[PDB]
Amino acid sequence: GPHMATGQDRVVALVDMDCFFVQVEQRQNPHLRNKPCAVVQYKSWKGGGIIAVSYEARAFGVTRSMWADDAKKLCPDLLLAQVRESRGKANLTKYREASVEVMEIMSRFAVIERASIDEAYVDLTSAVQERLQKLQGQPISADLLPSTYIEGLPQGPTVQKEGMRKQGLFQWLDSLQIDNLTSPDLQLTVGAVIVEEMRAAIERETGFQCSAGISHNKVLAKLACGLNKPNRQTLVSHGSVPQLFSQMPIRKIRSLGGKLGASVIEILGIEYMGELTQFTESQLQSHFGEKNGSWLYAMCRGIEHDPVKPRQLPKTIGCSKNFPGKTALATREQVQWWLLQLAQELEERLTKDRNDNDRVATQLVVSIRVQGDKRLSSLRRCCALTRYDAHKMSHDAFTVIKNCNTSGIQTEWSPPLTMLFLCATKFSAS
DNA sequence: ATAATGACGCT
DNA sequence: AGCGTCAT
Numbered sequence: 001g002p003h004m005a006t007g008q009d010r011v012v013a014l015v016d017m018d019c020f021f022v023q024v025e026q027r028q029n030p031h032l033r034n035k036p037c038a039v040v041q042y043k044s045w046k047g048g049g050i051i052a053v054s055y056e057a058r059a060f061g062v063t064r065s066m067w068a069d070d071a072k073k074l075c076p077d078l079l080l081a082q083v084r085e086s087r088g089k090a091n092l093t094k095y096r097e098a099s100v101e102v103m104e105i106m107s108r109f110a111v112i113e114r115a116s117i118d119e120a121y122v123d124l125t126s127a128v129q130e131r132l133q134k135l136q137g138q139p140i141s142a143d144l145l146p147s148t149y150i151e152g153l154p155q156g157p158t159v160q161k162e163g164m165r166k167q168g169l170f171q172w173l174d175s176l177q178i179d180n181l182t183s184p185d186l187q188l189t190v191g192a193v194i195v196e197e198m199r200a201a202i203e204r205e206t207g208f209q210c211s212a213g214i215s216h217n218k219v220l221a222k223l224a225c226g227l228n229k230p231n232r233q234t235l236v237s238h239g240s241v242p243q244l245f246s247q248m249p250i251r252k253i254r255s256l257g258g259k260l261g262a263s264v265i266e267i268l269g270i271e272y273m274g275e276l277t278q279f280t281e282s283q284l285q286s287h288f289g290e291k292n293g294s295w296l297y298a299m300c301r302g303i304e305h306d307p308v309k310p311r312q313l314p315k316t317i318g319c320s321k322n323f324p325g326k327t328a329l330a331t332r333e334q335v336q337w338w339l340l341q342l343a344q345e346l347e348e349r350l351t352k353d354r355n356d357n358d359r360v361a362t363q364l365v366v367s368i369r370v371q372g373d374k375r376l377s378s379l380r381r382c383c384a385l386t387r388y389d390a391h392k393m394s395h396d397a398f399t400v401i402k403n404c405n406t407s408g409i410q411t412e413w414s415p416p417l418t419m420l421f422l423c424a425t426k427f428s429a430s
Numbered sequence: 431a432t433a434a435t436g437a438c439g440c441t
Numbered sequence: 442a443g444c445g446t447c448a449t
């Protein structure tokens with residue numbers, strides 16, 4: 001009825017950089033531009049692990065987590081750039097810094113939530129309402145939306161991609177309710193215009209291309225974003241949700257890509273996101289818990305309330321290294337030395353962080369993984385972080401994990417460690 | 431023998 | 442406090 005909330009109160013975008021580490025390497029090395037190429041860490045073992053893949057290389061079947069030697073088998077022309085290595089581990093500084101370039105530019109338009117090294121949510125509600133004043137009911141030209149897809153359109157009465165895009169946009173714009181400043185669809189459309197500008201600015205000032213989703217909440221925006229990649233943006237309207245969700249595999253919806261998603265599928269005996277509508281909120285709550293049941297009930301109707309959190313800086317700073325199989329650390333001296341290598345990178349980055357962002361970390365968290373254990377972390381322990389000093393931090397870290405050592409001989413370490421992880425947390429202003 | 435990161439929920 | 446889930 002008239003008391004039915006429709007989740008159309010906000011305009012929310014998610015921006016995501018196209019094959020981000022590859023673009024960073026391609027900006028720096030013009031030889032890699034418009035070529036099949038990939039970013040790889042380490043190179044001794046099977047040519048290194050691939051962690052990012054240009055879209056040209058994707059067309060050959062090259063994927064993440066592939067060994068580089070295996071990728072060459074699919075794509076013999078594949079060009080590689082390798083991650084900087086410092087102190088025997090990967091060093092992602094180039095990408096973190098590239099990330100800051102993009103984030104500060106987006107920050108110029110609106111409050112952003114940094115969702116990863118190359119993704120940000122944008123709450124555009126205020127900017128849209130303001131822009132809606134700039135245009136005194138003035139119709140929105142197709143030319144303000146040159147890279148925008150309208151999900152679900154064209155419908156009813158062209159054989160190439162751009163032809164379809166435009167026909168969809170035209171059908172959308174022709175039906176638009178422009179003399180109504182409260183029309184959710186109009187707000188989204190104005191939201192999409194701004195995101196075009198934001199994306200133009202990002203490309204102009206960094207050289208980096210990205211894709212974006214624009215919708216009424218974060219989950220739909222994130223979904224919308226992946227529908228037309230690379231270098232394009234997608235508007236997903238509230239109206240588009242029933243058809244879109246009608247064949248949308250549950251695992252595609254953010255937070256449903258793991259075990260909860262799988263149990264939703266198994267317990268309810270369904271496949272697609274829209275099928276969730278046929279259950280009461282109480283039923284969903286009984287199967288998955290109050291919080292999940294409530295969230296599921298709203299979400300399958302395109303309604304979600306998770307706000308864009310005003311946070312542009314990460315809340316933790318960490319360094320980890322895995323030591324798979326034969327490389328697992330087996331002596332005290334190895335464990336101490338690698339904790340030191342981790343502590344040294346951490347200290348550089350913390351000192352940087354303290355000068356840039358006026359804050360200090362107050363807690364050190366130490367995480368290890370023992371051989372045979374499938375879990376990410378075998379064990380987590382903490383101590384105070386009182387000095388940005390590598391030798392102290394590495395020493396304290398050893399102290400809080402050292403009795404995990406089950407070995408009879410003091411110089412030996414067992415069970416061998418397959419991962420070391422140090423993370424600085426609990427920042428206070430400074 | 432993917433990695434190296436991150437955010438947050440549950441108890 | 443410490444472990445588990447989900448994501449890039």
Ligand SMILES: Cc1cn([C@H]2C[C@H](O)[C@@H](COP(=O)(O)OP(=O)(O)OP(=O)(O)O)O2)c(=O)[nH]c1=O
Pocket residue numbers: 016017018019020021022051052053117118229230449
């Ligand atoms: C998913 C993932 C990404 N990354 C890095 C490399 C990616 O370039 C970057 C962001 O990842 P994604 O956004 O997941 O991937 P992408 O940018 O490479 O490609 P797409 O265009 O499909 O978005 O972070 C990892 O190091 N490990 C990972 O598991």
Ligand SMILES: [Ca+2]
Pocket residue numbers: 016017018019020118
């Ligand atoms: Ca990306």
Ligand SMILES: [Ca+2]
Pocket residue numbers: 016017116118119449
């Ligand atoms: Ca991403």
